[PDB]
């Protein structure tokens, strides 16, 4: 069933996270880390003494690139996938995926372990296109800890709506610019991404000096952690992978049931236990993108 | 004249860092419980990746050193086949003299030590002058240091686990003072007294 | 603090009573509170703690049942009888307290 | 009072003694020889404090005179003797095996104290089977399922706290039960 050529392009496009240090004068300087070597390289990054709060900013942009396959060897599977996307959108809606993708943006999941011992951290983002004030979340640790807590925000429906339109309409696009404010303790440990190769961080020069960074792919993993969404339910810490091919609930064993899913989505009310979750997994994998060649 | 006795960590599965830390701990205890500080500590063998499998105590006074090596810890580890003790051997004239100086520089080179240094400067700013801004001070981009072992220690008056480190370096073969700090360190505030292998 | 205990209480009922008494408005917010507390003390099993009353028992935790029992014991120690009331699995099928198999455990079976 | 144990072994009266079944009484004295005189009777007098005190002295000796390191220690180095010994006793019934019941009580109540030194002890796969009553193939099965998370047939890859909690979660039996000893 899988054509010799079948590739999708990602719809969620996260960017790098750049850490900034805020002084009591409110002037901001890029965060810097020390490197120690023995005569083996170990990297240390801590909040400088006297710093008020660490600030992290990045931009994530949604797009409707899951509407049709980027490349497709055969025309039959192309219209099959397009009809599947249309039927899912019309019958189930993008609300669940939009909320799951937006909660990780707002609750600070992308900060990973940097929010472990912070007293309080705030998330304020400016969406685009926008027509009013910036969306603001205060004290995520205590205030916003659940779906109901997020929905009780002043304009939670408005922000999640523009993601639905971006996913639905062709050429539709929504851009967010997140800005975290971390009130870390004095000389608290900050944990950025470590480059593939001991502890050595990823670095990009900001304002003429190097700074620790969180990789764009690494931040995408936290944003897309909705189940991490992938072909198989791979778990990073515990090596074993769920949704194994034997379990019959991987991406491919679900993708090859496209005709059955098309029949189900149009016949009667789909079961919320089995078919709906499979549809959610299929569209979550489609949003991530990749190649399904063989 | 100097006299020394040595002890070897018999088990192969052991952290000689931890064993040397415990040895220095009992040594410091003896150096307080009694007022004497005659006995120093030396390692006959030293490796860039780990401290040697033997630790040798060197003292100018024979009786003090022998009484030190009668401490309860050594006795209760001797019969357990974990320690092997040599009675006493006069210092050979063919031995070499090097100093196992403790380095206080690393405690400030580390990040929390840098924070402590800046906080100390802020407190000492009570000496009248324009209030400095911490933003000016910053940590070095790259730091390179020589090999060290950083044996390890825990304070007793307060529950702070300060880790002591020692750097080995050769020195002039003569120094008659035969004085040391609370631990044998060859970096006594007064002088850097060498010890033999 | 510990509410009034008795043997017949099941794991879910005890959590209902504790959530009602400790001051939290309703359950499904207490389990959350717990998860965050476990995060604060840096317990490695904080990820797998259930959010809903269903499957709170360690017998419905798939491979992460040891983590759930560790979290339960740690919460109990930091003291009421959290264990025993739990429903576990055995290598012999289901064990709770000392019998192999305000609500009561007999209702569940 | 050394002659009282003759009445105790017979299986009646013996107020200062827990009147266990005669098989377990014999096993208990079997334990006692290693660790036959009048010292037997008053050990069980003020028994909880006495047993906790001997455990204190043994654990303190093994920790203060530890040779490997402050961390990364092994069960045998710190608790091996008392544990590995008393465990393999007839039937292994927790309630009847008073020594194992109290040992597990003390171990669980002192888990995660200090820096969790007892909850992070490295253990090998062999003793895990001994204290879990499990097969090597079954251990391989669970570690394949990632129920056991290593940090090999015989390697120190597990931790005492993890293994103990796995026993509490999946290896409780009708007679090897926690409720019979709390």
UniProtKB/TrEMBL annotation, chain A:
InterPro entries: CRISPR-assoc_prot_Csy3 (IPR013399). This is Cas7. It comes from Vibrio cholerae.
Automatic annotation (TrEMBL), chain B:
GO terms for biological process: maintenance of CRISPR repeat elements. It comes from the Bacteria. InterPro entries: CRISPR-assoc_prot_Csy4, CRISPR-Cas6/Csy4_sf. One of its GO terms (molecular function) is endonuclease activity. It comes from Vibrio cholerae. This is Cas6.
From TrEMBL, chain C:
Residues 2-109 form the TniQ domain. Transmembrane segments: none annotated. It comes from the Bacteria. This is TniQ. It comes from Vibrio cholerae.
UniProtKB/TrEMBL annotation, chain D:
Signal peptide: none annotated. It comes from the Bacteria. This is TniQ. The chain holds residues 196 to 391 of 394 of the full protein.
């Amino acid at each position: 069933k899988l054509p010799t050529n079948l590739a999708y392009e990602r719809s969620i496009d996260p960017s790098d996270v750049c850490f900034f240090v805020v002084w009591p004068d409110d002037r901001k300087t890029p965060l810097t880390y020390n490197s120690r070597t023995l005569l083996h390289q170990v990297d240390f990054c801590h909040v400088p003494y006297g710093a008020s709060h660490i600030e992290c900013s990045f931009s994530v942009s949604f797009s409707s690139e899951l509407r049709q396959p980027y490349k497709c060897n055969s025309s039959k599977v192309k219209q099959t996938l397009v009809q599947l996307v249309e039927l899912y959108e019309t019958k189930i809606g993008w609300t669940e995926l939009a909320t799951r993708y937006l909660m990780n943006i707002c609750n600070g999941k992308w900060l990973w372990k940097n929010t472990r011992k912070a007293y309080c951290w705030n998330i304020v983002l400016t969406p685009w296109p926008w027509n009013g004030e910036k969306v603001g979340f205060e004290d995520i640790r205590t205030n916003y800890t659940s779906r109901q807590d997020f929905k009780n925000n002043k304009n939670w429906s408005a922000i999640v709506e523009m993601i639905k339109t971006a996913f639905s309409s062709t050429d539709g696009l929504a851009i967010f610019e997140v800005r975290a404010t971390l009130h870390l303790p004095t000389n608290a440990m900050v944990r950025p991404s470590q480059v593939f190769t001991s502890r050595v961080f990823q670095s990009t020069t900001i304002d003429g000096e190097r700074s620790p960074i969180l990789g764009a792919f690494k931040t995408g993993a936290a944003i897309a952690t909705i189940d991490r969404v992938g072909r198989f339910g791979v778990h990073r810490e515990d090596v074993t992978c769920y949704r194994h091919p034997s379990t019959g609930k991987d991406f491919f064993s679900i993708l090859q049931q496209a005709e059955h899913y098309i029949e189900v989505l149009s016949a009667n009310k789909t079961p919320a236990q089995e078919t709906i979750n499979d549809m959610h997994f299929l569209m979550a994998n489609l949003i991530k993108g990749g190649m399904f060649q063989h | 004249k100097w006299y020394y006795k040595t002890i070897t960590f018999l088990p192969e599965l052991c952290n000689n860092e931890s064993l040397a830390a415990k040895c220095l701990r009992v040594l410091h205890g003896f150096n307080y419980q009694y007022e004497t500080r005659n006995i120093g500590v030396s390692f006959p063998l030293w490796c860039d990746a780990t401290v040697g499998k033997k630790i040798s105590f060197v003292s100018k006074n024979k009786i003090e050193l022998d009484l030190l090596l009668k401490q309860h810890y050594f006795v209760q580890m001797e019969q357990l086949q974990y320690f092997h003790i040599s009675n006493t051997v006069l210092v050979p004239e063919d031995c070499t003299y090097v100093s196992f100086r403790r380095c206080q520089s690393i405690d400030k080179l580390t990040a929390a030590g840098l924070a402590r240094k800046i906080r100390r400067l802020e407190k000492r700013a009570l000496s009248r002058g324009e209030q400095f801004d911490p933003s000016s001070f910053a940590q070095k981009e790259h730091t390179a240091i020589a090999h060290y072992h950083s044996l390890g220690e825990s304070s007793k008056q307060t529950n702070r686990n300060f880790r002591l480190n020692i750097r080995m370096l050769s020195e002039q073969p003569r120094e008659g003072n035969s004085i040391f700090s609370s631990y044998g360190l060859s970096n006594s505030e007064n002088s850097f007294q060498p010890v033999p292998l | 603090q510990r509410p009034k205990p008795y043997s017949d209480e099941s794991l879910e009922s005890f959590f209902i009573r504790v959530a009602n008494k400790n001051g939290y408005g309703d359950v499904h917010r207490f389990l959350e509170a717990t998860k965050r507390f476990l995060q604060d003390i840096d317990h490695n099993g904080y990820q797998t703690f259930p959010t809903d009353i269903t499957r709170i028992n360690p017998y419905s935790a798939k491979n992460s049942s040891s983590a759930r029992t560790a979290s339960f014991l740690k919460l109990a120690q930091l003291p009421p009888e959290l264990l025993g009331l739990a429903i576990n699995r055995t290598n012999m099928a289901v064990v709770r307290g000392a019998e192999v198999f305000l609500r009561e455990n007999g209702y569940a079976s | 009072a050394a002659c009282t144990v003759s009445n105790w072994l017979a299986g009646h009266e013996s107020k200062p003694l827990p009147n266990l079944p005669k098989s377990y009484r014999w096993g208990l004295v079997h334990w006692w020889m290693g660790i036959d005189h009048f010292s037997f009777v008053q050990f069980f007098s003020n028994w909880p404090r006495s047993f906790h005190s001997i455990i204190e002295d043994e654990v303190e000796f093994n920790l203060e005179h530890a040779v490997v390191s402050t961390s990364e220690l092994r069960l045998k180095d710190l608790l091996g003797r008392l544990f590995f010994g008393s465990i393999r006793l007839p039937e292994r019934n927790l309630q009847h095996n008073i020594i194992l019941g109290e040992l597990l009580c003390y171990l669980e109540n002192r888990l995660w104290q200090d820096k969790g030194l007892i909850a992070n002890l490295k253990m090998n796969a062999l003793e895990a089977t001994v204290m879990l009553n499990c097969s090597l193939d079954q251990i391989a099965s669970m570690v394949e399922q990632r129920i056991l998370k290593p940090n090999d047939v015989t390697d120190y890859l597990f931790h005492f706290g993890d293994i103990f909690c796995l026993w509490l979660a999946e290896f409780q039996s009708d007679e090897f039960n926690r409720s019979f000893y709390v």
